[PDB]
Amino acid sequence: SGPVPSRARVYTDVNTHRPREYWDYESHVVEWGNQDDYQLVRKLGRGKYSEVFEAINITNNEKVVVKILKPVKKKKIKREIKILENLRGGPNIITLADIVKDPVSRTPALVFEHVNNTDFKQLYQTLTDYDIRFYMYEILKALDYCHSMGIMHRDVKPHNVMIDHEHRKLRLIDWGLAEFYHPGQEYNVRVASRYFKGPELLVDYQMYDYSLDMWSLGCMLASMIFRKEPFFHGHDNYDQLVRIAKVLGTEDLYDYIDKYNIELDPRFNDILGRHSRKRWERFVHSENQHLVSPEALDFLDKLLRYDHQSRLTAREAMEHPYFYTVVKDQA
Ligand SMILES: Nc1ncnc2c1ncn2[C@@H]1O[C@H](COP(=O)(O)OP(=O)(O)NP(=O)(O)O)[C@@H](O)[C@H]1O
Ligand SMILES: [Cl-]
């Protein structure tokens, strides 16, 4: 028993027919810029992988954001730079304006455009049913683009989505965990945040694809329409698979892992139980019912499936009646 393999149903051979220099981020040269052009103003935040500053381009007075990367691996650093460059100009993908060496830290520093973002705790307590569809379509444009350029995000969550609600502007940020989908390739299952890890990561299945991003988008949507943040609230990676299973049930969980000849961590024998699949109507109450509709549940239902192969792709998702009410773009 070794796991059965898997391919993406879409965009399977994008990077097989693109040049080597497209996807091979190892053999990539960084074209540096003048660091004296930028003047730091304010610390916005500290991560495990970087510090982040609000800043000002001194050459044209533009406001700007500077992600100074901590030293970890030149592999990971060039990878983020090369994916951002490849995706430059795509819809609602955040724009890399420059790359400079910070003289203090001696590490690369990524200069992005500025987004006048709103706190996500303030924002998900205020979105109307229309706003939720609007921005979900906007994230979908971004996901289908990056998938169509042969790149999975692997860290889709509300913190990584900057929304300027004033101008209805949206931008998908932090491509630090993004990677190139190559068919047959086994990836590291230690990606994304806990609440938004799909079951493939949780059962240690390494041959995942673009559709991982769709599971996470489904988690984001569940919390927005049901007003439960986070929707699957697990204490650790083992309990996370149990919370999903209290909702989606264990019979379909076992079908999923038998289909790919995956064996569960023995520790599950003593915590997993047997759980009926629940109907989405149970999560509906007086305080979130204005956000729920038949078409919202239908869409959500097609995103939160165990089988990564049976999930809606980004393009199929954009075709759902859930988005019919949303205003498009003939002019
Ligand atoms: N283009 C941008 N516009 C505005 N704010 C941004 C932008 N990019 C990053 N930020 C800020 O940086 C945060 C996200 O940092 P990210 O780029 O996710 O770095 P990271 O290495 O993942 N760091 P951490 O998440 O903090 O461990 C946001 O909450 C903002 O405060
Ligand atoms: Cl990795």
Side-chain angles (χ1 to χ4, degrees):
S1 171
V4 177
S6 171
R7 294 294 177 285
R9 273 168 180 270
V10 293
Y11 304 133
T12 313
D13 327 309
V14 168
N15 302 314
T16 311
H17 302 331
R18 287 237 164 203
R20 176 101 90 71
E21 70 222 310
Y22 181 79
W23 50 262
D24 185 27
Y25 51 84
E26 294 154 53
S27 314
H28 175 34
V29 186
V30 185
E31 207 178 355
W32 307 105
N34 189 44
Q35 79 87 23
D36 307 273
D37 287 336
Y38 310 98
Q39 189 224 98
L40 304 181
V41 174
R42 208 153 70 75
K43 210 164 172 213
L44 293 177
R46 106 176 152 275
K48 198 192 166 85
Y49 286 114
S50 59
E51 302 208 300
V52 173
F53 298 79
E54 192 193 315
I56 215 98
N57 195 319
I58 235 114
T59 247
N60 46 46
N61 226 138
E62 230 69 22
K63 274 238 184 295
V64 131
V65 193
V66 188
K67 181 150 144 195
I68 305 183
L69 300 172
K70 310 248 166 212
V72 182
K73 246 285 111 63
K74 191 135 156 281
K75 196 169 132 158
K76 162 160 174 135
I77 296 290
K78 292 168 135 171
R79 186 227 264 159
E80 178 171 9
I81 288 164
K82 186 51 155 97
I83 274 152
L84 284 158
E85 279 196 346
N86 288 357
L87 297 166
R88 200 141 57 198
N92 304 327
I93 308 301
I94 211 267
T95 302
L96 184 69
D98 211 10
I99 300 121
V100 313
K101 254 164 168 91
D102 188 89
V104 168
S105 71
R106 289 145 98 280
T107 57
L110 311 180
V111 188
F112 303 95
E113 71 189 339
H114 178 262
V115 187
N116 199 341
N117 167 82
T118 332
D119 180 21
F120 103 92
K121 289 121 171 214
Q122 301 182 149
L123 198 37
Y124 285 10
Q125 269 169 136
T126 326
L127 289 213
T128 78
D129 176 41
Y130 183 77
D131 288 327
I132 293 163
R133 302 159 187 238
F134 182 83
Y135 291 129
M136 279 287 305
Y137 196 74
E138 289 295 299
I139 301 168
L140 279 163
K141 276 189 207 149
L143 278 174
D144 174 55
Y145 188 72
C146 88
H147 298 346
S148 78
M149 296 290 296
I151 287 139
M152 14 177 205
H153 195 263
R154 302 189 314 174
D155 195 17
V156 169
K157 76 201 171 204
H159 280 137
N160 282 348
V161 181
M162 301 282 108
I163 308 160
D164 181 4
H165 197 63
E166 199 163 316
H167 298 59
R168 310 200 73 155
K169 218 176 73 175
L170 185 144
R171 292 283 177 275
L172 182 51
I173 65 158
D174 190 28
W175 296 78
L177 296 191
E179 185 59 286
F180 290 82
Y181 177 73
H182 282 109
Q185 229 178 58
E186 318 205 86
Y187 298 94
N188 174 45
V189 305
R190 315 318 176 188
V191 300
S193 278
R194 189 195 304 140
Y195 306 133
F196 307 88
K197 292 167 184 285
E200 62 262 46
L201 313 178
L202 297 170
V203 302
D204 225 304
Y205 191 78
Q206 296 184 254
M207 271 205 71
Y208 59 85
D209 64 56
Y210 309 117
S211 60
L212 174 72
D213 293 332
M214 299 310 291
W215 173 270
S216 310
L217 185 74
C219 293
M220 269 186 71
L221 176 77
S223 59
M224 288 176 305
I225 75 176
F226 299 129
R227 288 260 218 99
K228 202 203 167 306
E229 204 277 311
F231 182 73
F232 306 120
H233 198 161
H235 301 316
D236 49 72
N237 294 356
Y238 308 121
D239 184 61
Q240 187 65 29
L241 185 57
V242 179
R243 301 302 186 176
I244 290 158
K246 278 188 222 233
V247 174
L248 297 184
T250 48
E251 267 160 346
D252 286 349
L253 175 49
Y254 279 122
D255 282 339
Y256 170 55
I257 62 168
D258 295 7
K259 159 165 193 288
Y260 297 105
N261 299 330
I262 293 152
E263 164 157 317
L264 275 181
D265 196 318
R267 186 79 105 165
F268 287 119
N269 305 149
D270 245 46
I271 53 124
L272 197 80
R274 48 253 189 75
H275 299 303
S276 68
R277 161 149 195 141
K278 312 301 185 306
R279 316 196 96 110
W280 298 114
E281 279 77 20
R282 173 198 289 213
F283 301 103
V284 176
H285 46 80
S286 70
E287 182 58 44
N288 69 24
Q289 84 202 214
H290 49 94
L291 307 176
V292 188
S293 52
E295 59 265 2
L297 302 185
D298 190 54
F299 183 45
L300 176 59
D301 185 48
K302 313 244 226 305
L303 295 181
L304 300 182
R305 268 112 139 72
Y306 285 116
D307 203 342
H308 57 288
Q309 283 187 10
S310 75
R311 284 176 214 150
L312 284 174
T313 54
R315 179 70 80 93
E316 287 180 305
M318 291 175 76
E319 303 286 316
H320 199 334
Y322 187 62
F323 303 110
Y324 293 176
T325 192
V326 163
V327 171
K328 310 311 200 318
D329 244 315
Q330 177 54 32

